[PDB]
Enzyme design. Sequence first.
Site, short mmCIF file in Angstrom:
data_model
loop_
_atom_site.label_atom_id
_atom_site.label_comp_id
_atom_site.label_asym_id
_atom_site.label_seq_id
_atom_site.Cartn_x
_atom_site.Cartn_y
_atom_site.Cartn_z
N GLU A 1 -33.67 31.55 9.12
CA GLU A 1 -32.81 30.50 8.60
C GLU A 1 -32.75 30.63 7.09
O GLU A 1 -33.77 30.87 6.46
CB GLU A 1 -33.40 29.14 8.91
CG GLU A 1 -33.31 28.78 10.33
CD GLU A 1 -31.93 28.36 10.78
OE1 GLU A 1 -30.98 28.40 9.96
OE2 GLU A 1 -31.76 28.03 11.96
N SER B 1 -28.64 27.13 15.54
CA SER B 1 -29.95 26.52 15.77
C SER B 1 -30.32 26.43 17.24
O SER B 1 -31.43 26.01 17.54
CB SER B 1 -30.01 25.15 15.16
OG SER B 1 -30.07 25.24 13.78
#
Length: 266
Positions: free
Chosen positions: A141, A43
């Site tokens: 993601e 992330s």
Amino acid sequence: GDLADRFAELERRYDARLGVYVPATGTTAAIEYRADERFAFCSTFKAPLVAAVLHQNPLTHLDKLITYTSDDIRSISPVAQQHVQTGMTIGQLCDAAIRYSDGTAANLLLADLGGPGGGTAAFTGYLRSLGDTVSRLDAEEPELNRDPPGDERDTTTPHAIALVLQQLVLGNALPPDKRALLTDWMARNTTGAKRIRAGFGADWKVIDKTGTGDYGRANDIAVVWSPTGVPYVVAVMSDRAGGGYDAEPREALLAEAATCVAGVLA
């Protein structure tokens, strides 16, 4: 003393691979450990993703409402999954992507950049525009967290990401108003208290963006300010790939690496 030896000791103690880069300043030497080795972003890419969106849009774009459905929640999305009926503005998505590591927010911001690969090619191109010739984002993601060790997909290096963050927060990659928004979101991150923040005393300001992934991946990229207001970029990346895809990521390794850095920078 030998700081590299101490970082190697941490690696042995945690059964981990650690990467560190703290860019040199007018007052300090660089700290570099495995700094040109590849590590998965996880992330941490969400910070430069927000910068990419800020870069290519006027600030009025932060008010653009983005709508999505429950079927768009494909990754851990603490904010977005509570706003399926309202949507979220681009600014709200930036806020969530950084401060809650919201994966749907990130995927929507990638889509906002546009182009093939749901925005992943565009994001890589934004890094190329900052002089980063190594990093690459290949998946959205949550798949970007899952590449096997040695696969170059979805990787950066400590050196590369540190110099990206340097340019974004301290340099002139963004105009100062946009710079301030990025900085503020990172300053109010909710996910980082046990990583670089835990290695610096409370008189140091820390802003950060975490990343966590498979193979025991645990990263944190930060900008810290000394008690006298001197800033430093700190990139710490780690994995525990020897333990398999379900190796436990270790926040404490990052806190300890940060404490080693804080020792040198004090």
